[PDB]
Amino acid sequence: TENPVLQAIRQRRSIRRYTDEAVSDEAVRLILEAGIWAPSGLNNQPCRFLVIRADDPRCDILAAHTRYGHIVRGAKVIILVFLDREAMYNEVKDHQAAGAAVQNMLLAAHALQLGAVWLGEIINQAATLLPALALDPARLSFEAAIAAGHPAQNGSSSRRPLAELLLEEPFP
Amino acid sequence: TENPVLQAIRQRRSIRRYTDEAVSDEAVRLILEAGIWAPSGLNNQPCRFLVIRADDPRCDILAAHTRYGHIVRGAKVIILVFLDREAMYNEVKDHQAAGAAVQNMLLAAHALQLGAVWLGEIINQAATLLPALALDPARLSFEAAIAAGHPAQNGSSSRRPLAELLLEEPFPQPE
Ligand SMILES: Cc1cc2nc3c(=O)[nH]c(=O)nc-3n(C[C@H](O)[C@H](O)[C@H](O)COP(=O)(O)O)c2cc1C
Numbered sequence: 001t002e003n004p005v006l007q008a009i010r011q012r013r014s015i016r017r018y019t020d021e022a023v024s025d026e027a028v029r030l031i032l033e034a035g036i037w038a039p040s041g042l043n044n045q046p047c048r049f050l051v052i053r054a055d056d057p058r059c060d061i062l063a064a065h066t067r068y069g070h071i072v073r074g075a076k077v078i079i080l081v082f083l084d085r086e087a088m089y090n091e092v093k094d095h096q097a098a099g100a101a102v103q104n105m106l107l108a109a110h111a112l113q114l115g116a117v118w119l120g121e122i123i124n125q126a127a128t129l130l131p132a133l134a135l136d137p138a139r140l141s142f143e144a145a146i147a148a149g150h151p152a153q154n155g156s157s158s159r160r161p162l163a164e165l166l167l168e169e170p171f172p
Numbered sequence: 173t174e175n176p177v178l179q180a181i182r183q184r185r186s187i188r189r190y191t192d193e194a195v196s197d198e199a200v201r202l203i204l205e206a207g208i209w210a211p212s213g214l215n216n217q218p219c220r221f222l223v224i225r226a227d228d229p230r231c232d233i234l235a236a237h238t239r240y241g242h243i244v245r246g247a248k249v250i251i252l253v254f255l256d257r258e259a260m261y262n263e264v265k266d267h268q269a270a271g272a273a274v275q276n277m278l279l280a281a282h283a284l285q286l287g288a289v290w291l292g293e294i295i296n297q298a299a300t301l302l303p304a305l306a307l308d309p310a311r312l313s314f315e316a317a318i319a320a321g322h323p324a325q326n327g328s329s330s331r332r333p334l335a336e337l338l339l340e341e342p343f344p345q346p347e
């Protein structure tokens with residue numbers, strides 16, 4: 001039996017090039033819903049979200065603040081992920097929570113047959129980007145941007161074998 | 173209603189009570205495989221894992237360094253998650269990657285009809301706990317422990333409405 005959840009986890013790829021087809025509001029809502037249901041340490045739910053569509057002037061602003069402008073410009077929708085500092089309890093664990101949210105969103109995108117890619121280089125420019133977007137970096141920590149669209153490529157990656165990542169070999 | 177991946181994301185719960193049923197090596201392997209396939213910056217793959225079964229004396233060590241000893245002693249398997257400090261490129265982003273790995277493992281456990289819970293309070297004791305497990309805190313950052321077993325309870329939780337979590341309303345009809 002090939003479990004669809006396990007299959008999705010294994011087959012989800014960073015997709016960085018999209019077709020010209022529209023991404024529906026309903027798809028975006030479903031992806032966002034996946035994000036909000038990720039866990040958080042105290043059920044503090046520190047993540048906040050901002051949707052930026054291709055036709056939005058803010059797409060150019062985002063592109064201007066990352067080396068991956070071509071991906072940003074090719075995407076149909078970009079979901080920006082932040083932590084509300086007033087909802088945080090622990091820096092390390094709230095960043096882990098943001099990762100869990102992003103992962104849920106990437107899996108949901110894949111499950112909807114959309115392609116997406118986690119963009120983290122862009123967060124290096126948070127200090128100039130947030131003000132450019134009229135957002136307050138004193139209140140918000142910028143965690144990630146997810147670029148998405150209908151896929152125009154299959155994606156390709158690799159991982160080292162499980163046995164190398166285990167600190168001790170647990171099987172007989 | 174129709175999508176199993178979306179259902180899993182929504183229905184996955186922190187399960188803290190388990191039956192006495194064994195968790196197979198194959199289940200543990202499938203969970204770990206889900207973990208290593210989470211994304212990481214640069215595909216650096218900074219996460220490292222240590223499996224501790226219930227019958228392992230190291231469970232007693234784990235239990236002595238957490239206020240959640242009932243969960244620790246009741247679990248059939250615990251997966252310790254770490255970042256390899258040599259493989260890190262950015263602490264925030266690598267913590268996020270550890271979160272994505274943990275989340276994949278929790279979804280994988282759920283998909284396998286297992287109950288699991290992300291334990292993070294335990295990492296507060298890393299400085300004393302790691303050396304007790306013969307691990308080097310100069311080499312590894314302790315990110316989380318996942319306690320797991322066949323479920324002896326359904327969990328329950330709540331989330332704020334999406335509308336309260338958006339910085340802006342993206343749909344024509346406000347949320
Ligand atoms: C924290 C983080 C930041 C990332 N930043 C970028 C980035 O800015 N640009 C990019 O193209 N991919 C980025 N990625 C995607 C990774 O390169 C990708 O996950 C990795 O190469 C493995 O490929 P896969 O996602 O297909 O499994 C990032 C991934 C993570 C988890």
Ligand SMILES: Cc1cc2nc3c(=O)[nH]c(=O)nc-3n(C[C@H](O)[C@H](O)[C@H](O)COP(=O)(O)O)c2cc1C
Pocket residue numbers: 038039040041042043093094096097184185186187188240289290291292293294327328329330
């Ligand atoms: C960073 C992190 C640390 C956590 N630590 C603990 C913990 O030590 N003990 C515990 O019982 N649950 C812990 N949890 C589980 C949360 O309490 C749980 O995810 C949250 O209450 C929402 O419940 P749900 O997982 O059923 O959706 C942790 C979750 C996260 C994301």
